[PDB]
Write a protein that binds this ligand. Sequence first.
Ligand code: WNG
Length: 460
Amino acid sequence: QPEPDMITIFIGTWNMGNAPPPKKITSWFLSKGQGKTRDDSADYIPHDIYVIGTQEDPLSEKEWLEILKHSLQEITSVTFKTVAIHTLWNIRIVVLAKPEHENRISHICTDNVKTGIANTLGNKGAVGVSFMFNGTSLGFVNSHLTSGSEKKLRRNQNYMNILRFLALGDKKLSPFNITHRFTHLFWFGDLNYRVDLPTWEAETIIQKIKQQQYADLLSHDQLLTERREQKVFLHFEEEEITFAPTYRFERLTRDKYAYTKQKATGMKYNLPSWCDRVLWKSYPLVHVVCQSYGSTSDIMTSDHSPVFATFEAGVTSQFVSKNGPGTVDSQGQIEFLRCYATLKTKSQTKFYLEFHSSCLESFVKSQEGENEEGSEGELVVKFGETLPKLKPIISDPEYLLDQHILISIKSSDSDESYGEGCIALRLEATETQLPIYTPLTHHGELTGHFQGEIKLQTSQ
Ligand SMILES: C(=C/c1ccccc1)/Nc1nc2ccccc2[nH]1
């Protein structure tokens, strides 16, 4: 039985509105309703992995797991295995996988982050799961961010707290947050960003929705605008939205948006909004293709509609040669030439690099770089040809060209990372000097850039 080089992943997010689900929720897992939907001819074909995020979930873990498993069995005639389930308050994540994957999945982590302080601590935050699937690291975050049209900045703060403090993936990657620890990272939930138009325009918005004319609404969606201004979700992707706003509906129909201020809303308006979202971030030059992104039309117990997204995702095998794992492969090397970091910091410490990768036996520390002043004020840290030669555990090009090098630039004075990035080894050529580049972030904000050239030697 051959190891896969692609899998399909289902991501679902649903704010259940504290109500039990209806007896049939199969449309969700079939990617049927509005938006980019799945072809009928694929209905019986199971996804490899199903990741279900709920918010305002009133069910026990047992109750929800029974509903999910029975739903997937009815669709696929497959009895899915539970990889992980984690709940914070009424925020939950379930990961299910085909039984044939049970001995491909390992290093399962779970964690949660509670957002806010005092007043604002007690119901919002995030849960997450990570694991390895053969040689590929996968992370999944379900977040329920702060509600309300006039709290977009709070949502952005909630995002930064979650990516700083959620402890998933390989703890040895100590300089790196979740935005760098995984081959593929999916972040979804009730992110609670709103369509930022005047209250007086509610009926006009509803009109536009009935005409399926979303362009003038999406141009005011706070998550798209905050992302465009680099305030949140830097370096994440989202598929184009082609489905109606998923909030706020009257329950038991989808015919009516309930937007007017009520005591139950704290006297706030809930203009129709795309609260419920799926985003991803994959390492450079790894295959990832969104094959569905939409909302169901027939699940009406909540004031939100369920959202689905599905993905093709490239995966690699658990590589064994005669040499690595447990020795180097003298036939392999990675050389960095003419490298420099450009940093936005105002500090004057020396910096060194760390190179982290599962193709190395352990991370590698460089010598300190040489600080210069850039033309437009910036700090430039020059490494020249001083960087260590990296010795990968396996030299086979079928392995090595699929790997990635994480880079952290650290202060000599504090050993704190000032910036993190990632370089793909999927090069156009081996034994050839080629340009490399990554942006550098810290706490998911842009802090600089790293650029130079690489020279990769494989056994071919
Ligand atoms: C281009 C413009 C845009 C971005 C966010 C929101 C709206 C428009 N899209 C985009 N450029 C990227 C570069 C690196 C990683 C991801 C990226 N996504």
